[PDB]
Amino acid sequence: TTYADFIASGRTGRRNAIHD
Amino acid sequence: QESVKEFLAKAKEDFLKKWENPAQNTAHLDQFERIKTLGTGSFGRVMLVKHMETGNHYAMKILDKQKVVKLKQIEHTLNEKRILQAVNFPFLVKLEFSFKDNSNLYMVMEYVPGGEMFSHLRRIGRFSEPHARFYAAQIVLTFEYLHSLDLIYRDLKPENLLIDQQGYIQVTDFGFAKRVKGRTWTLCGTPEYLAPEIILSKGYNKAVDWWALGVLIYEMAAGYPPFFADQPIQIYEKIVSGKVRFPSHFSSDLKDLLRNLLQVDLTKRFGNLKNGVNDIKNHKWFATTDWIAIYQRKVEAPFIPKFKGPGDTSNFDDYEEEEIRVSINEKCGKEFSEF
Numbered sequence: 001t002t003y004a005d006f007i008a009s010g011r012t013g014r015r016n017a018i019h020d
Numbered sequence: 021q022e023s024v025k026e027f028l029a030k031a032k033e034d035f036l037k038k039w040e041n042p043a044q045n046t047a048h049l050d051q052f053e054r055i056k057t058l059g060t061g062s063f064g065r066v067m068l069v070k071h072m073e074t075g076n077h078y079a080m081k082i083l084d085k086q087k088v089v090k091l092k093q094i095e096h097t098l099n100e101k102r103i104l105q106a107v108n109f110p111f112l113v114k115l116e117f118s119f120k121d122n123s124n125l126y127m128v129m130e131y132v133p134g135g136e137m138f139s140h141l142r143r144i145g146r147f148s149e150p151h152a153r154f155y156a157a158q159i160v161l162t163f164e165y166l167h168s169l170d171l172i173y174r175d176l177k178p179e180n181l182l183i184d185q186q187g188y189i190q191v192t193d194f195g196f197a198k199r200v201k202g203r204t205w206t207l208c209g210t211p212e213y214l215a216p217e218i219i220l221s222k223g224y225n226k227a228v229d230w231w232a233l234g235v236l237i238y239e240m241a242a243g244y245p246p247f248f249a250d251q252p253i254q255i256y257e258k259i260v261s262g263k264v265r266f267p268s269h270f271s272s273d274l275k276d277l278l279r280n281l282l283q284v285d286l287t288k289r290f291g292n293l294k295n296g297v298n299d300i301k302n303h304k305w306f307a308t309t310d311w312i313a314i315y316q317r318k319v320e321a322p323f324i325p326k327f328k329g330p331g332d333t334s335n336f337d338d339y340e341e342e343e344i345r346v347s348i349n350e351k352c353g354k355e356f357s358e359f
């Protein structure tokens with residue numbers, strides 16, 4: 001399921017901003 | 021509708037006066053008891069503090085000047101405080117004081133005790149459409165306000181939306197918002213929330229905030245964002261592909277809104293057309309939304325956080341504490357003169 005895919009992604013925690 | 025125009029003109033007058041003559045040095049570290057870390061960032065942390073003269077609690081951001089200079093972020097951090105001290109809107113966190121010492125920059129703002137939306141969303145899994153809509157409406161009005169001042173936020177996500185005592189949102193962390201009339205070019209934002217024109221190294225405008233609203237609404241209603249993968253590079257591929265799938269439980273109205281917010285062609289994206297924000301406000305998914313009542317905070321909130329009196333931090337998670345160190349030598353004085 002898409003939910004299962006989300007958990008598998010490792011990106012369920014707080015996400016940081018990015019830059020160059 | 022002329023009433024909106026009048027309100028925005030006065031709001032711009034108020035903002036510009038503060039923007040052009042920013043307040044400086046309105047408190048000192050020794051006036052606050054530091055209690056608990058509520059969150060962290062690249063150069064420091066936000067702590068619950070108590071103003072000792074009054075007993076009032078606030079949230080204080082502390083930034084290490086030398087760390088800011090190391091990562092080459094003088095301009096963004098100066099701008100963050102300049103914006104915070106200038107804006108005034110029901111869903112933007114309110115700055116109370118700011119100051120600096122030999123080591124650090126400090127911003128003392130309203131303490132928003134309900135915790136981060138991130139917390140509540142991950143705990144419940146997903147929000148009902150009415151619950152998501154309640155929060156989305158607040159962000160629509162906030163972007164109408166910010167965009168009228170030529171401010172692109174660039175970092176919408178549940179992590180930055182705090183829930184207050186009444187269950188309404190307060191937006192935080194203006195750490196790379198930019199005041200520009202037209203376009204800008206920097207790669208900035210959080211991977212899952214980046215519009216395709218950012219990723220593709222094109223010029224972009226305030227329409228990136230409307231793309232990000234599409235991402236937020238999707239995440240609130242589904243419990244996971246429209247584009248995710250193990251690594252940012254793979255997320256970016258999904259975003260630029262223009263392909264979004266919706267859960268079976270999404271309403272037809274919600275799907276139609278999202279297709280127009282998550283529109284890859286920025287010249288066709290809702291919020292960026294001739295009628296601007298009104299294409300969103302008048303969309304069928306918002307038909308039950310009383311926009312004036314949301315602004316006035318007169319709509320009953322779907323979720324009212326537990327609060328046990330002043331200084332209660334039970335809705336926040338736990339972070340490793342560090343005592344604030346203040347050097348006997350001034351660090352980076354010239355660089356931060358304006359703060």
Ligand SMILES: CC1(C)CCN(c2ccc(O)c(C(=O)c3ccc(C(=O)N[C@@H]4CCCNC[C@H]4NC(=O)c4ccncc4)cc3)c2)CC1
Nearest residue numbers: 019059060061062063064065066079131132179180192195
């Ligand atoms: C990607 C970059 C190149 C450019 C942007 N950078 C940047 C810019 C400005 C900054 O102030 C910083 C920071 O160091 C910084 C330092 C501390 C925090 C911070 O702790 N923020 C918390 C936690 C993060 C998620 N947002 C919620 C926020 N909490 C609150 O603001 C809050 C306010 C009132 N009541 C309760 C909480 C956020 C950012 C970092 C970092 C690097």
